[PDB]
């Protein structure tokens, strides 16, 4: 699973989706703003490597029946993948608005481009509701199309949950770090990345296999979280130690005073005087600042912190799958850990 | 219709709406969020003149059977109002970042409020997604709900379609006047304003009534249309000329350098020389350009022509409620001109 001929059938749904959502015969009296809107979806949707739209179809077709397997139904599942896309391409433009960014998928953020700027607002909130067309095109008809719908809308909510905790991290232009706690990233995380990174599109794929048991898709859960955790405490580590040519991204979090897993471990391991600096330096927009914080984590040895956590979550997760219900495909969840964690074995 | 008596059964409802998205049991792990988001729909949904939901009961009570109107019928058209409020609510969030306003409903816009922001962004989002999870609630049941819910989908795409088209008045900081015609305006209006604030209540009451008759919903459409132009054109003359203590709002439609209706009539009526102060100074973000143009729009007669425009178009749009048919209840459209005729809010 993702292979290089996946990708190929994955690929191949986006010019149909841009043409469903801009030249299918509507609003034919306002060409400039559908003109317009084809070019926000080619920057914005596309450009990313495609994880969650690709999860959606394997989940679907290790979830499903075999013999019900069809290029139509596999097909269905491609376009419930790009409507994850569709997703996650809006929640990156408000994102990088919210985080002031430089760069995402190795290009200026959106917000950045000439005539953007708060537009981009709009386009993010026209770039989400585009979903719900794409779903009623294809999907209005099957016994899926209510609860795929609730689905969309209630990971949704809860990812703007996740969005409002994570920037409650400042007030007043300083750090809150007396509460910059594992248990407070741990929520963070749950709802600002993990249900709509893992569980959508696994709860696509049982839907579309008609599996509508809450159990079911709990058991789930539990497995996709432990993986969300490990996803964005990777993307934490990356923000202050990775190159932003290989990441596609600038780093922002200590200038933003995010309570990233760096900061929440760093707080952990301080002394009183590292705990000092802290105060002092993180979530100031100053470069001396930045870079202190930096050398910092550097003198407090959290990249073989970081390390060691990605070793030790992968063993944790994998005996933790060999305990889910027999009613669920276990290889399902392994293929996920594994392309998250790049290894074959 | 829309009497002291109407407007309280609907503010009876607010304090529910705001339970249901943040005291039912869920997300017991998230408190602060879940409280501070209770604070978001407190300050940014009930404030303003509740045309729009109060139109969502009047249009139900007027199109269902006078037998079928139970507490519980009418309490549900309430509840579909304050979903439209909802969206209402979230549209102005996102509106007042773009535009760059000072104030909304007598208070600070939401975004320049102490330790909002760029927090902002994502309340806009949250709002929005909250109102499907009081449709899931309310509505499932009942086979309104696809028709109700695919309504809010495509209303929302157009309403970004609308948004977008509003904002290309500007390129690389001047307005494109050449392009600001009557034919723009009436297109932007129709895509930004119309569908959600006219369209969306009466179709929500025509499905809540168990009316799903294509062809009566067109005829609906083609009125309330008429009545959304009207509307924005209100709208765009108190930008300018409104009194910001009674309006709630101080405009900025010069200074951003909006097709606004105001803006278009001034280039239908200026001579050469008043036209070379249009493309010196609109859309300029000095105080001294933006005067220049109110003087220019004193002088013209503005005022006088907007008032004429007024009465001339509520004459017309009241002759073509009268050639309504499709069994539609002539009644339901003049009480909503009778509300917006004369406003100065
Ligand atoms: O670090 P963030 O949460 O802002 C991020 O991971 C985006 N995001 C937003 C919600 N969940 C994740 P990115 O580093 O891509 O800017
Ligand atoms: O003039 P706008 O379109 O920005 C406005 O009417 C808001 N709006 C946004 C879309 N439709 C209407 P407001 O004057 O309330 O700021
Ligand atoms: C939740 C996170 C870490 C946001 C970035 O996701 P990806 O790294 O999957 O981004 P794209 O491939 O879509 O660019
Ligand atoms: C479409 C428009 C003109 C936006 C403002 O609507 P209202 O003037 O109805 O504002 P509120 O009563 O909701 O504050
Ligand atoms: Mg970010
Ligand atoms: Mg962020
Ligand atoms: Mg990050
Ligand atoms: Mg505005
Ligand atoms: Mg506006
Ligand atoms: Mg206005």
């Not at 609003?27 to 739209?53: C, M, S």
């Not at 760096?262 to 330096?281: D, G, K, Y």
């Amino acid at each position: 699973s993702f292979s290089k001929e996946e990708s190929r059938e994955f690929m191949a749904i986006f010019p149909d989706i841009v043409r469903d959502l801009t030249d299918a015969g509507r609003h034919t009296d306002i060409p400039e703003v559908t003109k317009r809107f084809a070019k926000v979806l080619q920057y914005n949707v596309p450009t990313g490597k495609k994880t969650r739209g690709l999860s959606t179809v394997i989940a679907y077709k290790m979830l499903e029946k075999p013999e019900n397997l069809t290029p139509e139904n596999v097909r269905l599942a491609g376009i419930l993948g790009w409507c994850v896309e569709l997703l996650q391409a809006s929640l990156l433009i408000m994102d990088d608005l919210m985080d002031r960014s430089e760069t995402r998928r190795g290009q200026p953020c959106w917000y950045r481009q000439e005539n953007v700027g708060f537009l981009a607002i709009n386009d993010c909130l026209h770039v989400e509701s585009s979903l719900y067309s794409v779903l009623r095109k294809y999907f209005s008809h099957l016994p899926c199309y209510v609860p795929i719908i609730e689905l969309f809308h209630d990971v949704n909510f809860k990812t703007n949950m996740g969005q409002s905790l994570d920037a409650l991290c400042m007030k007043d232009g300083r750090p809150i770090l007396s509460q910059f706690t594992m248990k407070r990233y741990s929520s963070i995380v749950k709802y600002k990345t993990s249900y709509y990174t893992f569980q959508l599109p696994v709860s696509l794929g049982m839907y579309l296999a008609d599996m509508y048991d809450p159990e079911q898709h709990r058991q789930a859960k539990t497995i996709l979280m432990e993986i969300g955790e490990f996803f964005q405490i990777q993307d934490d580590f990356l923000d202050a130690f990775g190159d932003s040519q290989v990441t596609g991204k600038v780093g922002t979090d200590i200038k933003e005073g995010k309570c990233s897993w760096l900061a929440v471990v760093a707080l952990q391991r301080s002394n009183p005087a590292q705990r000092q600096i802290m105060e002092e330096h993180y979530g100031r927009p100053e470069p001396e600042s930045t870079q202190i914080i930096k050398n910092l984590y550097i003198e407090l040895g959290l990249p073989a912190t970081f390390a060691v956590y990605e070793e030790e979550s992968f063993n944790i997760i994998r005996t933790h799958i060999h305990q889910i219900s027999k009613g669920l495909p276990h290889d399902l969840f392994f293929k996920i850990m594994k392309k998250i964690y790049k290894r074959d074995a």
